[PDB]
Design an enzyme around this catalytic site. Structure first.
Site, short mmCIF file in Angstrom:
data_model
loop_
_atom_site.label_atom_id
_atom_site.label_comp_id
_atom_site.label_asym_id
_atom_site.label_seq_id
_atom_site.Cartn_x
_atom_site.Cartn_y
_atom_site.Cartn_z
N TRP B 39 41.49 3.82 57.95
CA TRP B 39 40.40 3.40 58.76
C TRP B 39 40.63 1.97 59.25
O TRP B 39 41.41 1.23 58.68
CB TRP B 39 39.06 3.57 58.03
N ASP B 58 45.32 2.56 52.42
CA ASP B 58 45.25 2.67 51.01
C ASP B 58 46.64 2.67 50.41
O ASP B 58 47.64 2.89 51.12
CB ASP B 58 44.47 3.92 50.57
N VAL B 88 35.82 8.14 53.02
CA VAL B 88 36.85 9.14 52.76
C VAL B 88 38.08 8.44 52.20
O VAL B 88 38.26 7.24 52.35
CB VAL B 88 37.22 9.95 54.01
N1 LIG Z 1 39.47 3.37 51.06
C1 LIG Z 1 38.72 4.37 50.59
C2 LIG Z 1 38.60 4.70 49.07
C3 LIG Z 1 37.64 5.87 48.88
C4 LIG Z 1 36.33 5.92 49.32
N2 LIG Z 1 35.80 7.13 48.96
C5 LIG Z 1 36.73 7.85 48.32
C6 LIG Z 1 36.73 9.13 47.75
C7 LIG Z 1 37.87 9.61 47.15
C8 LIG Z 1 39.02 8.83 47.09
C9 LIG Z 1 39.02 7.56 47.65
C10 LIG Z 1 37.89 7.08 48.26
#
Ligand SMILES: N=CCc1c[nH]c2ccccc12
Ligand SMILES: N=CCc1c[nH]c2ccccc12
Lengths: 360, 109, 361, 105
Positions: B39, B58, B88
């Site tokens: 993102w 990430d 996400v």
């Molecule tokens: N940069 C986003 C981390 C994250 C945010 N929500 C998540 C759900 C599952 C795994 C990782 C994440």
């Protein structure tokens, strides 16, 4: 424009690194090793170790070994017990070594996952629940021997004065010594006379390990020793950690990896607490006592900071202590330890910390 | 300052700051793998007063770092604007999708 | 004297049960569902859900469906994305349904893992990162195929007035409706006109879902509606949640699963906080506002208890709220909600709670 | 009272009390499997043999963690030892919670 890269090595020299084995008992399927710089408290990286991992660093300092259990679907499906070899500097997985599905699942006492002095064999405790000791040939990446002679015994104490020898504590209150051949198979063995009374003066399994002898402390504050300068181990004890004043306040040892030895001086470090009674053997330290193992007398006592486990670095004259979450760094170059710093939040649930080996 | 959730480049980080995890804002901790996708946030630089695009890649393939958790949401939008969305796992397409930590990579103005 | 036994059923009846989806973000590979009795706070059991699990209960109340990701060696090895079917009363695993390795990994919004009204299909969000909707045939235990028409859309809003239809929110600010055939493939579809401006008034994805319409709230406290009483969805809005005083103090919505609808009364529940500005859309609730969706007026406001997510039970006239760790139980049978109790320590990191279904035909 | 680490029969529990985990002192929570083996403690009822079977095959319950050590001994007295996972021989060894089963005097 910036570009994210991987493939990097740990940012601090090996000699600065320590390994905090975080069981993460509340979420024990996500145990891990946290790597810290003891000189400044900096978090350097980590190695995931799945369910109830155990860890050690290769004696040559090049690799990290883990031991863990997987299942195909974690809580169901086929079990795989393994040793993994990881690169110490890149903190990357290199090799999996298959074990029989009986590696010990339990708290992180040092003696459950060890190696020969020469570094060529990993030596690990099994429980099915019948006990035996498993031997892994690191170079071959294979489980090569299963020491059934060790049934009814527990834990592995390497002999630092021999390349492939170790001892285990047996149900008779004696020690079984195993000498491995260069193939990792048992080359010979011997059994000591009874060292301690299992019923009347049980010892903690954690050794205060010298080059050619080991000391053990008991639930009641006695000390036993095993001298392995020869092929046959000679055992002795008890002497008491306690003087009359100590006895009046019911001081006894307590903890997990609760002792250590500074080899150059013969000082033994032990976590102690007052008001000892049945059931207090795992209590946090009220004090650390510093014992002269030659004179069999205490030389110093300092606050324990609720520590449960420790480890010693011989060449830098350091002691780490660990209260489950925080790591205390002490200078032990003189008889009274000096607290240098505390690393807060090093783990959620750790009972074991270890230095990166520097002695080759 | 980079280890703080309020550092200006971290304005749309939902995750653990990689700089607290043995990496830096632009390098994954040892043994964790960058995500090829991310993102994007638009963050205000408090020094020059200009807005910059930050790519939140990430680092993946190791379990949660657990340090310096941040949940900042400047200009973040829901999944129907997918590459502005931070609820996400941006490790979702990595060879191993386990989420380790989040970086804050400056793209440009 | 005594003998340890297993094989036991959950001790409280279904109608007492709620499901707290604990992401355990700090140790996200050990996420799980915690089952609680909402009437007394008792912990009843749990279902392990590996990495970033999602959960729902079958419409008929018999099964728990989870969605998760495994790898052969957790942090390495082959990926398996799955739906699992668990028995609700025994909390035991029954069946794994294989998914393509692109199920959404993300926080637990309801709309990422849903089912058709008739219960015959599980409907889930995929992201590879290209988006599509996945359809699972429950009777067959099979993945059907991707709904590729949903590319550039997000989340699943079932239509409660049809057996196997649902909608998704698309990047053009409209809704895409999908109607499945009896085999779970797309039989027909339609796209609404633009409901909201994506740039100027983005909506939260969480629907306040009625039987034949859905309401959505925006980052700036507007309300949009989608009426699906006819075959084509009719969209409208905005109207504002805010009066002049509200606006003066910059009240806006915030949270995750942040709205709910009490269908019989038309009351909509929304988490709100003051001093809104860019970046506050996931802030904990300072208050819960209760809106009459017919009159478009606020009928109550109460302390938010820092809640982030909620759910409504139509059959018992209840609202649960959840602040990440603690679950608040409210009676919403009158316009002002009444707080009944708080269940402390229900989760370490949960953004979703759900009731065990009662009735609902 | 049974949900307390100080309850008399929990005198050598290292783990989460099953009675806080949707089970009872003598029954596993739904979907978790009793261990066929255990450590054994000797506890005073204000003396009884208590068998500490674990419940297995679900991840950690997390509730009512206890670490009581009355008469507990190290692994060279293996069946008196509570720093090992008594789920170790189960079909799935993941540790869920610990029970406290009265055997007899
Ligand atoms: N940069 C986003 C981390 C994250 C945010 N929500 C998540 C759900 C599952 C795994 C990782 C994440
Ligand atoms: N009743 C013993 C729980 C326990 C104690 N230590 C453990 C290590 C791994 C798994 C479980 C345990």
């Amino acid at each position: 424009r910036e570009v994210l890269t991987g493939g990097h090595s740990v940012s601090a020299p090996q000699e600065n690194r320590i390994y905090v084995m975080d069981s993460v008992f509340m979420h024990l399927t996500e145990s891990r090793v946290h790597v810290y710089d003891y000189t400044n408290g900096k978090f350097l990286g980590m190695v995931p170790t799945a369910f109830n991992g155990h860890v050690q660093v290769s004696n040559d300092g090049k690799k990290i070994y883990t031991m863990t259990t997987y299942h195909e679907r974690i809580t169901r499906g086929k079990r795989s017990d393994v040793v993994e070899v990881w690169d110490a500097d890149k903190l990357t997985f290199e090799k999996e070594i298959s074990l029989p599905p009986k590696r010990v699942q339990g708290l992180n006492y040092d003696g459950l996952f060890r190696q020969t002095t020469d570094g060529k064999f990993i030596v690990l405790q099994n429980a099915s629940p019948a006990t035996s000791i498993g031997i892994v040939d690191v170079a071959k990446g294979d489980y090569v021997e299963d020491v059934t002679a060790a049934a009814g015994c527990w834990s592995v104490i390497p002999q630092p004065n021999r390349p492939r020898s170790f001892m285990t504590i047996c149900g008779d209150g004696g020690l079984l010594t195993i000498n491995l051949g260069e193939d990792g198979k048992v080359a010979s063995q011997s059994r000591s006379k009874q060292m301690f009374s299992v019923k009347d003066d049980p010892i903690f399994i954690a050794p205060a390990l010298d080059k050619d002898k080991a000391h053990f402390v008991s639930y009641y504050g006695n000390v036993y020793s095993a001298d392995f300068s020869g092929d046959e181990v000679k055992v002795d004890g008890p002497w008491s950690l306690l003087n009359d004043e100590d006895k009046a306040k019911n001081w006894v040892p307590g903890g997990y990896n609760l002792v250590g030895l500074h080899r150059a001086s013969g000082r033994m470090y032990v976590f102690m607490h007052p008001d000892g009674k049945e059931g207090t053997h795992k209590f946090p330290a009220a004090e650390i006592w510093v014992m002269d193992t030659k004179t069999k007398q205490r030389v110093a006592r300092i606050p324990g900071r609720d520590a449960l486990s420790m480890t010693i670095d011989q060449q830098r004259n350091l002691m780490l202590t660990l209260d489950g979450g925080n790591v205390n760094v002490y200078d032990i170059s003189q008889p009274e330890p000096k607290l240098l710093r505390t690393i807060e939040g090093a783990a959620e649930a750790s009972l074991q910390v270890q230095f990166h080996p520097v002695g080759g | 300052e980079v280890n703080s959730c309020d550092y200006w480049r971290h304005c749309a980080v939902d995750g653990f700051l990689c700089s607290c995890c043995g990496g830096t804002t632009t390098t994954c901790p040892p043994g964790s793998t960058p995500s090829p996708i991310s993102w994007i946030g638009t963050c205000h630089n408090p020094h020059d007063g200009k807005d910059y695009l930050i790519s939140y890649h990430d680092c993946c393939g190791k379990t949660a770092c657990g340090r310096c958790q941040c949940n900042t949401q400047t200009r973040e939008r829901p999944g129907y604007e997918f590459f502005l969305h931070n609820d996400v796992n941006w490790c979702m397409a990595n060879e191993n999708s386990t989420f380790h930590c989040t970086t804050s990579v400056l793209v440009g103005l």
